[model samples]
Target: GNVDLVFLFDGSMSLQPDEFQKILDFMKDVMKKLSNTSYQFAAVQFSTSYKTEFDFSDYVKRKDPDALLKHVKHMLLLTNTFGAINYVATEVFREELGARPDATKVLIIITDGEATDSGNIDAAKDIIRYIIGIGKHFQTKESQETLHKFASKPASEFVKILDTFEKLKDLFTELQKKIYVIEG
Candidate 1:
């Protein structure tokens, strides 16, 4: 199946402008690597709010690669991670990009710290169920176990969220390489 990749970038003050640019560079490399794959990319910048910066189909159809790249490079840093997450899940995913058929839809959030908003996990759970569909895929026993492991953590332990985002670059890079080998 084709894949719909939505990048939710953290636009918090914790990430300096330079650091944010580095992450954007990493994301650009990831996009370049996916050129041959049946994947579409969209970007949502989240800080105090979530805004769709560019849609993959628009970029491809208009042949405005440079404009798309510029939009990503010029992302501004904003605060309030929790609001961003909620906005992305509720507005961006639910309203703009949900109901994508015949595609593996994924929302990749890139955050640098703990969520300041107390309702983040609850919002995530709701969004997950809504998009993935309720049932085994959304809340099977196995999925619940995974959720339990993630939830059984202190508030201070949320630094791991940032770690996960950091790893995404390498993870996607390796995955694409393997896919290339298989295709070849």
Candidate 2:
């Protein structure tokens, strides 16, 4: 039940400003499906820069959801996907969010454009693998190998965001169902 997910929004110029509103709407819908008591949310907005828009503890302590929603609504979009991702992976993930105990840490990055600094992908991959290694569960030999394969390549290249969303949603929903069965 202790799960923390970081939603990294690509606030780059490539995405229409209006699309961020849509993303907020989708995020609100997604939040409804999650148990606020058990599932935690944090936000990281990336332009050519990165900011930890909201921390996980902020969500847990807040009495008004609108305040958080307003923060999301007003977030400015800048240019730079890779820079932001790398920042979140290193500074936020490693130093900030990574220290939490008994929580599943996931970085859900939504980007419509390519990385501005492609070279940072290796650092990003290394950070991800290091976090996975230090977290509650040890990566299996097979899983570790697969992560190595993912790390060996340039991180800037990836599938479409919409496709990634669909896949992630499917996995999240399946896990939810399994959790329901176990809890029931």
Candidate 3:
């Protein structure tokens, strides 16, 4: 009984240093309680290129829960999250990469800007994709609309639009209620 989870952070040139710290805080807050048995974590950051920070095995083998957080210190990239998704599908989340054959696969993309590339018609129905947009409403609801495209379905359920990084706590507070209630 385990789930394989991957994080795709926006590490493009647009990402700021302060915002990057907030993203790291957001991740640590949500994942500190997660363990390797029920949930395995791997991460990748992008800034025109994809860099694998660590894989599920690394988390367990290295015996470090905060290893991934160490790498989120820098970012500025998203070379078509679809390609990141592609790599996760074939390599990152693939069973060969430590994904349990029957475990759930979760992909969380924390992006702070508009996505320049697109095109995943069928989408990843099997992999649950969550998009967290942390920034201002540039086009007046434009950010929300764009982030919606990255979610699974019923965007509001999978996509979270925050006015600021501070709001990540509220969103996760709500999510923790739901997720932990189920776990109980």
- The local distance difference test score of each candidate is 0.52, 0.52, 0.71
Model 2 regions lying over 4 Å from their true place = 63-65, 73-78, 94-99, 121-184
Ranking by lDDT: 3, 2, 1
Model 1: per-residue lDDT, tens digit, 44-109? 776665677776565455433345657554334554555655665455543244334566655555
Q: TM-score per candidate, in order? A: 0.61, 0.62, 0.86
Candidate 3 stretches greater than 4 Å from native:
72-79, 121-123, 137-139, 181-184
Candidate with the greatest lDDT versus the true structure: 3
Return the TM-score for candidate 1, rounded to 2 decimals: 0.61
Clashing pairs in 1: 11-78
Q: RMSD of candidate 1 to the true fold?
A: 9.1
Ordering by TM-score: 3, 2, 1
Q: How does model 2 score by TM-score? A: 0.62
**Model 3 C-alpha lDDT per residue in residues 11-59, reported as the tens digit of each score:** 7666667777777677766667565347778887765657778887777
Clashes of 2: 1
lDDT of 2 by residue, 1-184 (tens): 4666667776655455566565555555556666445677767777767778767666767724446667654335554655665676566653254335666656665554444455455555533221111111123443233323323234333212232233444544544664453353
Native-structure RMSD, model 3: 2.4
Better of 1 and 3 by lDDT: 3
